[PDB]
Amino acid sequence: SEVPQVVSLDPTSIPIEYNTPIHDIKVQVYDIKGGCNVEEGLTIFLVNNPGKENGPVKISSKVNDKQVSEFLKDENMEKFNVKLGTSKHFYMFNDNKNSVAVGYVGCGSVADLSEADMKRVVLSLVTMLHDNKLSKLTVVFEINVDKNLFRFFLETLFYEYMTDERFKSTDKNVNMEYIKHLGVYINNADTYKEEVEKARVYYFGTYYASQLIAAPSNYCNPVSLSNAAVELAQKLNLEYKILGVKELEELKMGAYLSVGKGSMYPNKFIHLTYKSKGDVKKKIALVGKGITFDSGGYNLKAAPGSMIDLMKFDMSGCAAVLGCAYCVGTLKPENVEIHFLSAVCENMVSKNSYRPGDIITASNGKTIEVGNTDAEGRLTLADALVYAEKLGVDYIVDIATLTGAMLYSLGTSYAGVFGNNEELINKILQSSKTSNEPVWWLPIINEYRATLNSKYADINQISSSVKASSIVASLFLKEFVQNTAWAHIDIAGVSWNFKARKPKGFGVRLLTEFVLN
Amino acid sequence: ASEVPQVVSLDPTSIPIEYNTPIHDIKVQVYDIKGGCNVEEGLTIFLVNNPGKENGPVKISSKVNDKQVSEFLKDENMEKFNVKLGTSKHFYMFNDNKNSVAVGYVGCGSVADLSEADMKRVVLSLVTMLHDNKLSKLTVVFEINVDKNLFRFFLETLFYEYMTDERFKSNMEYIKHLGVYINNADTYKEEVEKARVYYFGTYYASQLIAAPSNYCNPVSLSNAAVELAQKLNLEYKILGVKELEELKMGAYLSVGKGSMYPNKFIHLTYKSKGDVKKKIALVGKGITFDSGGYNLKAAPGSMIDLMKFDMSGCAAVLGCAYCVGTLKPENVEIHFLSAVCENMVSKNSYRPGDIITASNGKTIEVGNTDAEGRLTLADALVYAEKLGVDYIVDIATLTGAMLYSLGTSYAGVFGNNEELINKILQSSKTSNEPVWWLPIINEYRATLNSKYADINQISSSVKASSIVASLFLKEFVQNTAWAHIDIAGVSWNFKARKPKGFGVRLLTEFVLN
């Protein structure tokens, strides 16, 4: 629990915001058939025009105000169009002779919006929220969205609206004011009301993950991260267990322990557990890669394009699992038992570091020839997977920033899923659809297995020949699951939002939807 | 035929092609294994596995009609050997009639069902024995389980790997007979002559790919296509620069500008005798050498000495033309297309930054002259859609990034129509040429928005270049089902230093079934 320091100025904990401004927003949902009351703050209409590309804007909703209705006549709205992402502000007086702000956001010509489309809309909406001190936002849905897309709108709204200022000091935004009320007008609102607080849960789980990832490696280290996981578990009444080095040694986790050797921080294996009250139908282990900083070790990330300064993100997998733990522990699903696992450590350069060429022994007794110390993720998951299987679960799903090759195969939008079981894979893909976090199925090609044959050890860590890293890595991991349905989600490409310079918190909602449904 | 230009009189003016191979002279018999085996001639090899027992002992179950070989095959002798996938042994001995025979086995592992990767290992081990064999007959006994497709794969692979390409050259002899013992022999007999056709289609494509760029150029390759068309009685047409200019194929012609060889657009057509119920266009990338242009392949690992293989897509299509023109399917009309050129460095070459206009009217800003494949394909695809076909399938050594996604075994397929993709995937299964469905991610499309042209050729940032390329090609197919097979990673067999002729059997199964 005691975070070691080099100097007294070194942080001893991760700053974490639980009570966010988003949580102080009173969210009300009304049915659109009763007409919209425009009284205060900003009222935004979500409007589209099916068929006609860049077609005119029309407000079909009934507006419980004479003046505002007249303003929003088709004659006045004709000049503006519905191009996806477009937004305009309006200013007028209502029946009460009060000034009020109104606007709209263009949702395009398609009848149904995709994942990227809805995010575009939310991002336009957020630009209306920034640099404008408002106390209330009202959103009127004049497009068709199902419950999962509606929930996604809210989660995305909350996430993008929220600004992380934990590490700001002399440069806090002096104009940072959040709305206190959120009104939503939608058709058949009763069915959507339950999606509100689910979205706020999904929002924080994601933002919590984001907070851990964005936290630099001097704040977020194996000790502080495991201390944080404990605190979360305590707040959620989850059972928790943190495995220290001596316990890890008894479990003979040589692959995991070797990776952490060069670090000033002791390895910490995180093990949280949720169990439903009553009969457990499904037991699930979620495994997240928890490298708090990845320098590459003696295979130092020195080559152009290696992006060593991003490598605080190499615990994004762990963060996803902890975010999921928040969501699951909050929403309390029935008939499941969930283990949240992460072999957390740091990959550093030291006199004590493991070397290229070292042969190390995993907890399942397999000897491993280390070909590249910067392929340290699969080493820690190997021992984590053996641990997961010993729990006697039905499903093991690991999530990890494992291979840079994902940027060349799927890019920055879709994560890859590999596995040994088609049913689990389809459950993952299904959860991908309902969580609106895109995943694509990639193959474990067995012809490459021979390239992991070692002359001296039981198996090679990395291949040579084969340059298909994501597949070879999946081949390696498969060797540490003997007979359990297993899947592997490589989020190396999608975890960090390069354009926005922040984490996505990718995987929290995906893993939660998998566990819940 | 066109006169291929020369720099010096020693420059070759055609691609040497072998049509009649020793493989075609092999007489193939298929016997049912239930009746026991005859072993009086040549080389006999047993395909053996041991389920459950990894690297377990060899055990031969078949009864053989020779006492001398029966003693050799007894369990106490054979258990000295093991069934590790690819492991083989063979011994020479006299049989009952005092004739010299050779007897052995190839291990097939401990898994009862072989993948095509496993089967290729087995065949390779077999071929190695054949390359040191002078006997006239090989007999293969399947003490394993294979379905009709995998058995046809076994024969195709055997024929292909057995054959050695000696065209450019200035201990063994080819067998005259092949015997097969296998359960339910009658139902496999129809796969033999299909395997012999698939073999040559694959091997012919292989000859074109392996043909160096001084032998195989746009003129000589198009000449060969014509000669293939003439032998198969296919309709054919070669479009030269003048008619390509009139068709306004600015993208295609821009790539060729810097070459001493004029661009040649290959168009072969197979039309069935009966009514036509499906029209297909098959499009193959045909770069006879890819230097990279002014974006020269100079970086470490760019493997410029390999780039004679950049017309592998074209070879696959032409090899498919052979199989289709030979097997003569019904109710179908197939167009075999290839915009052939050479990508070179010259005073006349297209430049990075040049804005060029495709035949469909779109202007393209060239960001990288080494992304030349998609430019040629763009005009090819515009040509194909004007034919009014139900399906357009293109196949191309398009993006090196395939090595980082699927690697050297699996090709990637992208497309705009789920039905066509599933048909490709189904064809991958029955042809045993592995292919994986990859996505065309629409969120990346914005990276192709040019400041000045209608569209960018490449992205500046995206990194997912195989998908970005697919998005580029997609822009030139307006309302036809279209799929794109990227064979950049799978075309060349790096370990064996030769082509695979990948795609011939895949495409043929697609049009046949």
Add this chain to the structure above:
Amino acid sequence: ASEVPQVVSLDPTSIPIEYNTPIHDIKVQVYDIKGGCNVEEGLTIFLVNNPGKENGPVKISSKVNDKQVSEFLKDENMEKFNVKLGTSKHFYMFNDNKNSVAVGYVGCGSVADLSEADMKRVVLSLVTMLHDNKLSKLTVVFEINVDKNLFRFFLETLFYEYMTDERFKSTDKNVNMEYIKHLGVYINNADTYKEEVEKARVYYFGTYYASQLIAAPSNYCNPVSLSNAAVELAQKLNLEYKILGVKELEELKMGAYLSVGKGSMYPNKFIHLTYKSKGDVKKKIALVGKGITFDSGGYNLKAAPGSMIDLMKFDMSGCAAVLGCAYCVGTLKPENVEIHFLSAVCENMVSKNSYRPGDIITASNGKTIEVGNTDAEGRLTLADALVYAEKLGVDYIVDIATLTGAMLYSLGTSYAGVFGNNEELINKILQSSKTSNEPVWWLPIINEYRATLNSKYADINQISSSVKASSIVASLFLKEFVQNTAWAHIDIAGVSWNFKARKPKGFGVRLLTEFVLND
């Protein structure tokens, strides 16, 4: 024996060493061909060639004491097979006693004088016949002309290549691992070749022992665990031994060697083994091996493409060769000679405690050295070892080291390079290269390059500025630490590791031993 420091309790604390190998269980019998060949159980392989006629037909000229086998192996039956170098075939037949026997041949080409490289091709073919076949015996019939040395080389290579290192296998041990118990050899003038058999078995293990050390990863083979293994070897051979630690190294003022090791968690250990004859000593020799148990490069980290930092466990190959030579010498026990076996062992790591590029360090002979590259550490450790060596007062100093990557561009992977300050000694190394069949080539120490080692602040630069001819410059540097003693330097950076087979060669063991013995 020192205690090996651990970071975690799962860190290994010794090198696993296999002394009693299955090769040592093989009984070898040598017969004269004049008596005829008996063919029974196991595998009987004829080594045949056909002079002049490339890929000519196989002919078996040896007498075979079996009518059935003789009939099978008659000219008319063999002419369908050819003698292409490396070709092999298996035969099956019943002999005069109605027992089934296995026979065959390995083609030895169309040249009567087989080179050491072509002989390795023959042995590898023969080994492929041994693998995946549970045999109790192998018989070899030499129908080619080989001298005593090449015959011994055949046996050494057979033993070495047949052997399979499974020390680090856990779940992936080969279940079908079974070795012959008997080896028969038929050859003309057999009584003259018999003396080579045990010599070959000794040379095999000396070579195989070195290979085990080299192949051992750096978490197993570190300076403490390696010096410990040297102690154990000396104890089994009754060699004198002394392991010098940091304290005594400091007293001896070995600043160059010590600075290399500063960055490691493992303390420096200087190995000193000694063999002395019971007879009057007539010549004294020191053998010096480079002993970097892992070479990360230091602050000049190996991060450049093609630097193969994952191979860097090999960087104690020189030390391994010397220790392998110690085994052979302590076993064969040469007379009238005193041999010192030396290695300044350490690990070149990156650390707050590491030595830095630009550092100026003082060697044990008082020479100050300016460090231009932390990855040029071998010659620093050797500098102090060479000074130490000459203080012993010996006749010859020979060092062996994986020193410079440039060797791959000069001699490649087959020939080692030898440099020196004495012609007579160099000729003897070249002579031992011939009689051991470990290829070495004489390379010059070009004095004109010496000026590029002129330091502005120190007495001498570690590395050159101009040059690029690293192997020669490094030799120039080393020469500065040998005042008045015959000295030779064997660079084995190119030949140490077998890249195709992914294993060490144990190169240098036989070479050094032949050098010790043949004088």
